[PDB]
């Protein structure tokens with residue numbers, strides 16, 4: 019563990035094709051990356067939180083505990099296993115945004 023870092027699985031909705039896939043997310047500094055899985059050598063995408071305008075809870079999904087990250091180019095919809103896990107991600111992400 020390292021303060022400011024977090025890694026774990028989250029389910030996310032696709033862009034054009036809105037299928038939900040379980041991906042491994044890692045947060046270090048201001049980079050939020052997601053991989054196919056925990057042992058994936060390379061990320062599918064590297065998101066820079068300096069471009070993120072907000073992180074908010076999302077109550078409009080099929081999954082109960084979801085939140086989204088808003089970027090000018092796209093809003094990502096992610097869901098955690100529990101409200102607790104969702105809160106952990108939301109709190110650390112907002113914390114990141116607060117220092118930006």
Ligand SMILES: O=P(O)(O)O[C@H]1[C@H](O)[C@@H](OP(=O)(O)O)[C@H](OP(=O)(O)O)[C@@H](OP(=O)(O)O)[C@H]1O
Nearest residue numbers: 030031032033034035036037038039041062063
């Ligand atoms: O796997 P299928 O059912 O074909 O649907 C894919 C996955 O949801 C992708 O997620 P992942 O990349 O995690 O595999 C997603 O890319 P994102 O990563 O941008 O969400 C694609 O969005 P579009 O490329 O926008 O259609 C979507 O077409």
